[PDB]
Design a binder for this molecule. Structure first.
Ligand SMILES: CCOc1cc(CC(=O)N[C@@H](CC(C)C)c2ccccc2N2CCCCC2)ccc1C(=O)O
Ligand SMILES: Nc1ncnc2c1ncn2[C@@H]1O[C@H](COP(=O)(O)OP(=O)(O)OP(=O)(O)O)[C@@H](O)[C@H]1O
Ligand SMILES: Nc1ncnc2c1ncn2[C@@H]1O[C@H](COP(=O)(O)OP(=O)(O)O)[C@@H](O)[C@H]1O
Ligand SMILES: [Mg+2]
Ligand SMILES: [Mg+2]
Length: 1164
């Protein structure tokens, strides 16, 4: 009975059910059983950690610890691998014996030898496939522990700027994605280092015995394949490494277009800004050409050399040896080269991965050495962010139990430092910290949000309590902003989630601390980017009413001393030293100056598959498929030619043999180049069009579509097409022809074999049909679960302070251990499913050999031909698997092309204008007059007009003001000028021309608009002044001085051509608004649209805008939508829009004069 269990483990019958289930229902984690504790990340991490700690007892070596953990399984796998190679060598020996016994006793009989071959091949591949699976179990178990192990370091890292920085996040994000995968892949290929070289030595050893001194000449050439393959391998790495480099920043430029896409389209240089991506795109391809050529060359040397090896052998033996070639010798030896081609060709891969693994392990072992770390009573505190210099000195604070212990100080002054020191985030060189450590609900000063729901973010692993959630939402005033969110409390936020504003981001985290039921809180300047009212609102209810009900301690570091009276305690610290400790009563009496000085500052106020091929052009598609037929035609004839030559058992046969191999070598070059030459042309045309369609795409699409999904087309899907399809498409065509031809050639040698084909074809089709859908679905799971694992590691890296603060370590560790477990299963059952296919094609493959062996014995053909059929029988079993696995890989990759093709045909905005271009003369908007005729404006095809029946004549040069109710038709009207929102009815006429009846790009260009938050794109300031570059350089300097920025610019390096960070990082927010004004003047628009211009702008900077607008654009007409409606008091023409209706339309003073209308209530 236990033989049944051994067999079932040996042929992966256990996977079979799942495979069949894939047809009935998609395979999913529910359908896949839970991973055994023998392979869960917990046990693997414990084993590896125990080995590593024993090593640390003996710096410890990662390599030796990994061996001590995972040695026995790879020893077993290598034993299986040897037993597989030795039985694989039965192939040539059995073929030689058969051919000798045929053509005229227990072992000599061909039948007994034929059956022996059938048992050998079955046993060879049962062993060989099992040997692969053991390493995969070992390899995955290794990746299981490492991801757990390096994660333990992340929670124990230190956030000091010295030990952690922007460079640090590069390693950890890359270590999980790359360093471990390279280390895992090495383990998959670990046996080969001592398996393939043993086979190579044996293969040559047999060759000499088969032929004589001739085979060495052929063996010598074949040996040279491996050094060639390594030299080609290195050149691929440099070609690919450069290729990734251009691709990496090409995505960065892609992100800039896709984020803030409206901004580019408004200024009409969406086309021009796109071409900046094409410039890098051509360089990306210029790396690919060097890569594609070398990949084709690697294919060439994989085929041209063995054919040159045989040509070197048989020609040699025809002269060095008096004996004419015998049929048994030829096809025994000729088979052996096919046995040796794969290990010689792939040996460059295993050694290269050995180099990569040793690179990563050294990289990963450097990682581990990275630096690792009265409610609150601290006396004589001395804290330092490393650097051997106490960043905090003379620290002595007391935080009374269950009271608001607020801290006051100036810029710097150890503001955030004091809190983190209590949390163990920095070294305390002296003193002692007494939590008189409980869980501390610290709030990060910076905004760090998980890629999950707001409710999860506020609960943060706490049991839901809507009444407790109610007060938190009310006290932190999270209720109103929630209504705006798509899925409410189930709105996923963060980098993966919806992009928020700074003020709303801060309140979410603060709410978390109130949610957590702990005696201690550390609220770090929540009002950093908040309105004063909400902070006052929080100080009344959230700070006092909510917390005092819980009677928990609060330590709120504050900069406005107006709330110190509310504070039960005040802590004054400056220069990293505590100025004085005491309440407001104690501080004023003891430190009279502090009371006045603070108050002084307080006073201060598969049809796609065919579609993909045709992309290059019919000739390129024809040439590839036409030539590949010819290559096999010559190759097969070469194998046949030996049958004609060896049937003799001699300058004729050799002569015809050299030329054939000459064409075979040459045709190998042609069929190698044509496939890749298709790939680049197929790669270029697909991506080239795609960027155009997105740019012309409607703005409404970008609002609907998540930003993560759109960029995925250019990041992953385009990567698949460019680099993965041409390799797979090459191997599929090569493997199919070999399988199609070999079955043909065997059948031609033994026509009786065709009767035996009827069942075998049926069996192959069912395995081909069923596995494809089972591998495709598992493939989706492997990618699906891999991505959140990387997201978790990046999320835990950022803001470890909170994780250490809340004592959320263990819960977060558990999340990772389960997250990786869901990922290993997907990859493990992807490899086990793939193994199931390989076993059941060899069990099928052995049947082809067995039928070919038995049929050939019965046939009385030429002794060479019966040998030839057996040769292809052995080759079939090798390639009959890759015709399925590559096809599955091709089918999945055709998914990317299907997605791209949809985007290509999905949508466009109508850039063409019906009226002739001659209609618009030079400087059309010069007049500046605006005319609105019964306008109706709604972006969504079926929706109410956001602007309805709008009509208000605008005089030329009139600083018209438009305002109303918050969220009631104010900004929509702005884009209505820019036609971004379709004017379903009515019309807008500017200077006697309806804006609808004009080319779209003309309308966008000749206008000037300023959004609420200006954004500056990567490049020079000249790039941000005129991407079109048409404007002469003289004007560019004028605008900055007009914008009052030229003086600031001159200090910057490079003068006018000064590099600018993407997104306006270099310039301050106030400075950012200055950049737009520079763009405003150059256009000579005569129309300015300042929608929410003063919004998100400091009052000091705001005065400049009013100074600039009244002066710089006096002749221009400024249609202002003010953040503060008071600025429209002096507007000569003022429009009020409520519910999409012109509720008030008169002069500013006349608005108060006519009646206490909407504007009058708006201001007052
Ligand atoms: C675990 C993922 O990877 C594997 C890994 C293995 C273990 C393994 O030494 N393979 C040999 C193949 C045989 C022909 C030697 C090999 C060696 C060097 C380079 C690649 C490969 N192979 C692996 C990558 C695909 C190309 C051939 C088996 C099977 C697989 C697999 O596909 O599932
Ligand atoms: N995590 C850290 N790593 C290294 N240096 C730090 C760290 N936190 C603070 N410092 C340094 O300690 C000093 C005082 O920082 P402090 O805690 O007062 O900041 P802050 O006033 O809260 O900051 P900000 O208001 O700019 O956000 C500064 O020199 C600062 O660079
Ligand atoms: N992307 C969107 N999709 C659907 N409706 C929106 C979208 N953005 C805004 N709205 C709604 O349309 C109105 C537009 O208001 P608007 O006139 O643009 O002034 P503001 O921009 O100051 O809200 C808002 O009340 C809002 O509720
Ligand atoms: Mg700070
Ligand atoms: Mg608005």
């Amino acid at each position: 009975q236990p033989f049944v269990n051994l067999l079932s483990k040996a042929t992966y019958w256990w996977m079979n059910t799942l495979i069949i289930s894939a047809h009935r229902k998609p395979i999913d984690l529910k359908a896949i059983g839970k991973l055994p504790i023998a392979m869960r990340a917990v046990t693997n991490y414990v084993c590896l950690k125990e080995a590593y700690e024993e090593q640390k007892k003996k710096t410890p070596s990662i390599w030796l610890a990994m061996y001590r953990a995972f040695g026995r399984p790879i020893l077993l796998s290598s034993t299986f691998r040897y037993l597989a190679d030795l039985l694989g060598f039965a192939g040539p020996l059995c073929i030689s014996g058969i051919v000798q016994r045929v053509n005229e006793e227990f072992l000599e009989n061909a039948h007994v030898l034929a059956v022996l071959l059938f048992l050998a091949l079955i046993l060879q591949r049962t062993f060989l496939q099992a040997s692969y699976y053991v390493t995969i179990e070992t390899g995955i178990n290794l990746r299981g522990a490492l991801l757990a192990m390096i994660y333990n370091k992340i929670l124990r890292l230190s956030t000091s700027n010295l030990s952690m920085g922007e460079m640090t996040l590069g390693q950890i994000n890359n270590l999980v994605a790359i360093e471990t995968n390279q280390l895992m892949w090495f383990l998959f290929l670990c046996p080969n280092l001592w398996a393939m070289p043993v086979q190579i030595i044996m293969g040559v050893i047999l060759l000499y015995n088969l032929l004589g001194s001739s085979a060495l000449v052929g063996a010598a050439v074949i040996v040279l394949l491996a050094p060639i393959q390594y030299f080609i391998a290195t050149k691929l790495a440099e070609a690919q490494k450069s290729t990734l480099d251009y691709s990496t920043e090409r995505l960065k430029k892609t992100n800039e277009i896709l984020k803030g896409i409206k901004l580019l389209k408004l200024y009409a240089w969406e086309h021009i800004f796109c071409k900046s991506v094409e410039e890098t795109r051509m360089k990306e391809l210029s790396s690919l050409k060097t890569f594609a050529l070398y990949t084709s060359l690697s294919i060439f040397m994989n085929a041209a050399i063995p054919i040159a090896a045989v040509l070197a052998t048989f020609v040699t033996h025809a002269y060095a040896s008096g004996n004419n070639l015998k049929p048994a010798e030829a096809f025994a030896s000729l088979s052996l080269f096919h046995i040796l081609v794969t290990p010689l060709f792939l040996l460059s891969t295993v050694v290269r991965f050995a180099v990569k693994a040793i690179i990563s392990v050294q990289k990963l072992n450097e990682f581990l050495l990275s630096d690792e770390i009265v409610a609150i009573k601290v006396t004589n505190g001395y804290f330092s962010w490393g650097s051997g210099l106490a960043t905090l000195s003379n620290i002595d604070i007391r935080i009374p139990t269950g009271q608001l212990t607020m801290i006051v100080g100036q810029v710097g002054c150890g503001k955030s430092s004091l809190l983190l020191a209590i949390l163990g985030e920095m070294q305390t060189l002296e003193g002692k910290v007494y939590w008189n450590r409980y869980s501390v609900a610290y709030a990060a000063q910076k905004p760090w949000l998980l890629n999950a729901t707001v409710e999860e973010n506020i609960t943060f692993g706490s049991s839901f309590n809507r009444q407790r959630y109610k007060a938190v939402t009310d006290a932190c005033s999270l209720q109103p902003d929630i209504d705006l969110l798509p899925f409410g409390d189930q709105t996923e936020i963060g980098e993966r989630g919806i992009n928020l504003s700074g003020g709303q981001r801060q309140r979410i985290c603060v709410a978390r601390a109130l949610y957590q039921n702990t005696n201690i809180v550390f609220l770090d300047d929540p009002f950093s980017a908040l309105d004063i009212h909400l902070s006052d609102h929080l100080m009344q209810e959230g700070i006092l009413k909510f917390l005092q009900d819980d009677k928990r301690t609060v330590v709120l570091v504050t900069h406005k001393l107006q709330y110190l009276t509310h504070a039960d305690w005040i802590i004054a610290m400056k220069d990293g030293s505590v100025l004085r400790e005491g309440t407001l009563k104690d501080i004023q009496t003891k430190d009279v100056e502090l009371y006045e000085h603070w108050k002084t500052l307080m006073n201060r106020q598969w049809k796609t598959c065919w579609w993909y091929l045709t992309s290059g052009g019919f000739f390129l598609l024809f040439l590839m498929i036409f030539s590949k037929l010819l290559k096999h035609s010559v190759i097969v004839a070469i194998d046949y030619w030996l049958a004609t030559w060896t049937s003799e058992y001699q300058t004729f046969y050799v002569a015809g043999f050299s030329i054939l191999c000459g064409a075979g070598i040459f045709l190998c070059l042609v069929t190698s180049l044509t496939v890749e030459w298709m790939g680049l042309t197929a790669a270029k045309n697909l991506h080239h069009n795609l960027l155009n369609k997105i740019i012309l795409g409607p703005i409404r699409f970008f609002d609907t579509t998540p930003l993560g999904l759109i960029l995925n087309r250019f990041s992953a899907d385009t990567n698949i097409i460019d680099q993965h399809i041409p390799p797979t498409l090459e191997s599929l065509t090569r493997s199919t022809l070999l399988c199609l031809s070999a079955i043909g050639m065997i059948s031609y040698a033994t026509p009786v074999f065709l009767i035996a084909l009827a069942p075998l074809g049926v069996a192959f089709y069912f395995i081909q049909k069923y596995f494809r859908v089972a591998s495709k679905d598992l493939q989706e799971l492997d990618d699906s679960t891999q991505l959140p694992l990387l997201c978790h590691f990046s999320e835990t890296a950022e803001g470890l302070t909170t994780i250490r603060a809340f004592r959320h370590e263990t819960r977060f560790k558990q999340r990772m251990l389960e997250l990786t477990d869901t990922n290993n299963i997907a990859y493990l059952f992807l490899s086990a499913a793939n193994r199931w296919l390989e076993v059941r094609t060899d069990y099928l493959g052995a049947c082809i050999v067995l039928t070919a062996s038995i049929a050939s014995i019965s046939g009385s053909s030429n002794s060479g031909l019966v040998g030839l059929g057996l040769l292809y029988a052995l080759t079939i079993t090798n390639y009959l698997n890759w015709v399925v696995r590559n096809l599955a890989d091709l089918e999945v990759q055709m998914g990317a092309v299907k997605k791209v093709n949809s985007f290509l045909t999905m949508e466009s905005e109508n850039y063409e204008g019906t009226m002739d271009p001659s209609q618009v003369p030079e400087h059309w908007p010069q007049e500046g007059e605006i005319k609105i005729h019964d306008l109706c404006v709604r972006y969504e095809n079926n929706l109410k007009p956001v602007l309805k029946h709008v009509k208000a004549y605008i005089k030329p040069g009139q600083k018209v003001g438009i305002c109303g109710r918050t969220g009631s038709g104010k900004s929509s009207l702005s884009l209505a000028f820019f036609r971004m929102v379709d004017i379903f009815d009515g019309k807008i006429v500017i200077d006697g021309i309806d804006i609808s009846k004009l080319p779209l790009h003309t309308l966008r260009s000749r206008l000037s608009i300023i959004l609420q938050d200006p954004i500056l794109f990567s490049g020079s300031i000249r790039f941000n002044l005129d991407p079109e570059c048409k404007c002469t350089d003289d004007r560019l300097w004028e605008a900055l001085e007009i914008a009052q920025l030229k003086n600031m610019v001159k200090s910057l390096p490079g003068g006018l051509d000064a590099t600018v960070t993407e997104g306006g990082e270099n310039f301050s927010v106030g400075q950012r608004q200055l950049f737009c004004l520079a763009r405003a003047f150059v256009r000579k628009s005569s129309i300015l649209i300042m929608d929410e211009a003063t919004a998100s702008i400091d009052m000091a900077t705001e005065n400049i805008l009013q100074k600039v607008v009244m002066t710089a654009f006096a002749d221009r007409t400024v249609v202002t939508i003010a953040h503060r409606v008071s600025s429209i008091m002096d507007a000569g023409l003022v429009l009020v829009f409520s519910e999409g209706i012109l509720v008030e339309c008169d002069t500013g003073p006349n608005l108060l004069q006519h009646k206490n209308g909407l504007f009058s209530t708006l201001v007052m």
